[PDB]
């Protein structure tokens, strides 16, 4: 039942990469400094520069590796 076996592993590859990337020690890079436009109901967004990354900005969330 090829399609059923392929369905049971439909979320393996995003869980191995997208759902869990930067849980290691060395973390950095550049990230967009997007700000919410302060009238909240407007749902407007502005790119307001860059944000250099550090180890307090890496995900505190647990990795999806064990499941």
């Amino acid at each position: 039942s090829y399609a059923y076996t392929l369905l049971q592993m439909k979320s393996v590859f995003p869980a191995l990469s997208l759902r869990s990337m930067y849980r290691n020690k060395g973390f950095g890079g550049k990230a967009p400094a997007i700000e919410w436009t302060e009238p909240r109901s407007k749902y407007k967004f502005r790119w307001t520069g860059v944000t250099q990354l550090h180890d307090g900005l890496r995900p505190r969330s647990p990795s999806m590796d064990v499941p």
Binding site: A33, T51, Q52, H54
Partner: protein, 48 residues
């Protein structure tokens, strides 16, 4: 009788920072990590 030793005098804290300015390079590429270390905390906790 707890003993939680943390505090230095102001003479001891100012002695450390001069040696911290001695251990640092005097160019613009070594004081750039300091001005952005605080700039990250300025963006982090801000009303504006």
């Amino acid at each position: 009788t707890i003993l939680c030793p943390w505090f230095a005098s102001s003479e001891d804290l100012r002695l450390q920072q001069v040696m911290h300015l001695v251990n640092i390079s005097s160019n613009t590429a070594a004081a750039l990590p300091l001005v952005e270390a605080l700039s990250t905390l300025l963006r982090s906790v801000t009303p504006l």
